[PDB]
Amino acid sequence: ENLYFQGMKKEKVEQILAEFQLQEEDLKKVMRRMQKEMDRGLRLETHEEASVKMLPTYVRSTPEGSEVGDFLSLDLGGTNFRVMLVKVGSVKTKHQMYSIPEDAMTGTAEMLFDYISECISDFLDKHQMKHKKLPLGFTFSFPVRHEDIDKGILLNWTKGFKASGAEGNNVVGLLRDAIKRRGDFEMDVVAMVNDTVATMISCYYEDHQCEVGMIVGTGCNACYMEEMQNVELVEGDEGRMCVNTEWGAFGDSGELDEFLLEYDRLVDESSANPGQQLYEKLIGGKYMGELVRLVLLRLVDENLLFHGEASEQLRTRGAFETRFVSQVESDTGDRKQIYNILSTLGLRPSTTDCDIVRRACESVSTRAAHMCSAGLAGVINRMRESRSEDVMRITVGVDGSVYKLHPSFKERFHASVRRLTPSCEITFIESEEGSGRGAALVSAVACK
Ligand SMILES: Cc1cnc(NC(=O)c2cc(Oc3cnc(C(=O)N(C)C)nc3)c3cc(C)oc3c2)cn1
Ligand SMILES: OC[C@H]1O[C@H](O)[C@H](O)[C@@H](O)[C@@H]1O
Ligand code: NA
């Protein structure tokens, strides 16, 4: 054992883990670069080359006038596929979740939308309603270049999605075509929204100060209410329009290069979209645990962890799940939680190994919280400037398992957004069934 040696090991672990550190000045630089990229995406002259697409959603700040009744909501792209029935009068919901097979997410668009329509059919039978033709709102968690609220093309798949015959086509069209092939129900697709947009809308229903939507789950993205005069891609300078930043693609033109560590390159190289969504790759739940797995293999190689031996499970892709990062950080100090996770990964961890794993997890999750904060602060700072407000009071509607379930992420992120947002008063709100509710609320407003 030896207490002096155990300590020397933790000191070398720390020297390696120090590479994850971001100073406040590094965060201001990342923020200013994000802001620079946001200005570029919004302008007609630089939009095509901008990595941050600042996509117009066609969701506008409207005086009001919502329709009443039953609205169907679809949710694709997060954790599984969701069908929701929404009653607007007051808003009450009925919902069901479906596990998307891999063969659908990695086969053809036809297979993907066929499965989606099969699920819709099943939801309608379980609620006895495959006869009623309802207005339908679609949450589609991918970059889309809109023509209108109900018409938009998929730019590219993100988060490991690979279905053929989708990129370059109208997503509402693919959906509508799938429903017709099946022929057992009828729906009127009135709106297609990003998950950030749906979250902002459902959170706004509870707090009218909500004008920013943020996702920190499988992926990482944000939307906000932009001045119509700044939205150059849409003719008009009156009122506001929701803009999907698609900030996951920040760093794709080399904007984050000085901060990319070896673990980031490996995660990217072994990903379904290499060279894409690099900022998201620093924060997202699809990558977080994989980043911890890579750091652990590095420490196994320096003879600082597990007697320098990694098990088959520790050398398995995606084996250190993001939930294990959250769970390792939940550990009360007894090390029981860390121990069980490691035992299940075929390791014989000592108390020191448990502590080192705890440290690698905090280094990765604290970096994610800090990178994410630079992005939110840039959006918020830009809004304060655009609205020419001395002190801007805004509410941010947030969804996702990383922001929601990680034990310290949320706290580290809020404190870092605060340091970077002086003269800003930010309220953070967590969405209760965010996406589904949001897509139907936009549908009720749109259905006039
Ligand atoms: C074509 C088009 C253009 N813009 C929109 N625009 C919209 O649908 C719409 C709905 C909104 O949120 C709402 C949430 N709930 C309710 C509500 O209480 N209902 C009963 C629905 N209303 C609004 C918000 C909030 C912001 C900051 O901008 C919004 C736009 C919709 N369609
Ligand atoms: O799900 C969170 C985010 O993940 C990815 O970055 C998608 O491209 C984006 O559309 C979505 O909002
Ligand atoms: Na405009």
Side-chain angles (χ1 to χ4, degrees), residues 58-62 66 88 149 200-201 204-205 210-211 225 441-442 444-446:
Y58 286 86
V59 171
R60 292 159 191 265
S61 64
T62 183
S66 174
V88 174
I149 198 131
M200 181 200 77
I201 282 116
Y204 171 96
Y205 178 82
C210 189
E211 285 182 79
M225 295 310 281
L441 291 165
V442 193
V445 173

Side-chain angles (χ1 to χ4, degrees), residues 76-78 140-144 156-159 194-197 214-222 244 246-249 277 280:
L76 172 77
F140 179 76
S141 309
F142 301 95
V144 162
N156 39 269
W157 284 124
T158 56
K159 305 164 278 192
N194 187 253
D195 56 334
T196 57
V197 177
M214 201 191 54
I215 305 287
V216 205
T218 295
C220 192
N221 194 15
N244 174 12
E246 277 303 328
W247 78 14
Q277 310 285 111
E280 163 160 272

Side-chain angles (χ1 to χ4, degrees), residues 386-428:
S386 296
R387 300 167 184 215
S388 318
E389 288 204 10
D390 273 349
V391 187
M392 192 188 71
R393 298 181 175 173
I394 194 143
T395 294
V396 176
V398 190
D399 207 356
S401 51
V402 167
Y403 180 97
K404 280 183 166 185
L405 302 164
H406 195 292
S408 41
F409 179 96
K410 192 196 293 178
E411 290 90 339
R412 286 161 182 166
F413 170 82
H414 292 163
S416 192
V417 171
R418 279 149 178 157
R419 291 193 281 270
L420 295 167
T421 51
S423 282
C424 285
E425 267 172 51
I426 315 144
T427 304
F428 286 97

